[PDB]
Design a protein around this ligand. Structure first.
Ligand SMILES: O=c1ccn([C@H]2C[C@H](O)[C@@H](COP(=O)(O)NP(=O)(O)OP(=O)(O)O)O2)c(=O)[nH]1
Ligand SMILES: [Mg+2]
Lengths: 144, 139
């Protein structure tokens, strides 16, 4: 911005960018570029991923058990599961951010391949190319 | 503004002809069971790849950034099926995630666990995801 800027409205931060803000706030490693992790970092990410996936499973189970007894679930009844699913997003993004890997760039490539694959007969369309996550990591290593 | 990863899942489901509801919608049992299996397989792939990398480190290998591509791929696949579950429930993942994120920033003054996990300071208050769901259902 400069003296010519009369309005400066940014696009909302992405969920991946939010993880960077969180790790900066708590003093956790959050490298700009792909960075081989110490084993202690890998162990933590594993622990948080296990913790979060167990909580998601417990809420899905609770919903199935209630549903079975003639409780027909309501929308508000989805709130704990939604919270746990968001926590699982949070620690999945969190692992990518601590690896210095732009999760949006990797996701975009996975989405490109998946969305392209949906144009096939699920079978692949002609000329389909799978997600090249290795290429994304390489290009992230050379970014501005 | 470019689309979000949650909005990408909405586009994906519309593209495979399995268009998903716009507002929170209680699911049939088989949908919960399907989404759970997808989460379990994706989580197991991530779990296995982290164990794989740790064993290489225990052998003395110095990992490179390129060595991280399979893990990054599996983590992104886990994002895909996690966002996918929220989308099939009709729940805006970004609205829920913003509420969870705000309640995680408020932990910054808390202590850390020995393994590095951020713990909660005195008086911390949880995210109110019930309120986000009510916001999404109405209006
Ligand atoms: O180091 C951390 C700690 C927490 N988090 C995030 C992940 C998730 O969104 C949320 C989980 O925090 P807790 O493990 O403390 N679970 P919860 O808040 O549900 O505690 P409890 O079940 O005991 O009420 O905080 C991180 O990302 N990194
Ligand atoms: Mg909990």
């Amino acid at each position: 911005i400069d003296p010519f800027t009369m309005s400066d409205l940014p696009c909302p931060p992405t969920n991946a960018e939010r993880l960077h803000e969180f790790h900066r706030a708590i003093g956790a490693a959050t490298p700009e570029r792909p960075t081989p992790p110490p084993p202690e970092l890998l162990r933590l990410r594993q622990t948080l991923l296990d913790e979060a996936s167990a909580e998601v499973r417990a809420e899905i189970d609770h919903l199935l058990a209630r549903q079975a007894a003639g409780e027909a679930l309501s929308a508000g009844d989805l709130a704990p599961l939604a919270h746990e699913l968001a926590d699982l997003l949070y620690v999945t993004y969190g692992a990518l951010d601590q690896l210095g890997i732009d999760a949006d760039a990797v996701f975009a490539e996975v989405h490109r391949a998946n969305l392209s694959k949906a144009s096939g007969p699920q079978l692949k369309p002609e000329g389909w190319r799978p997600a090249d996550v290795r290429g994304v990591i390489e290009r992230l290593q050379h970014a501005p």
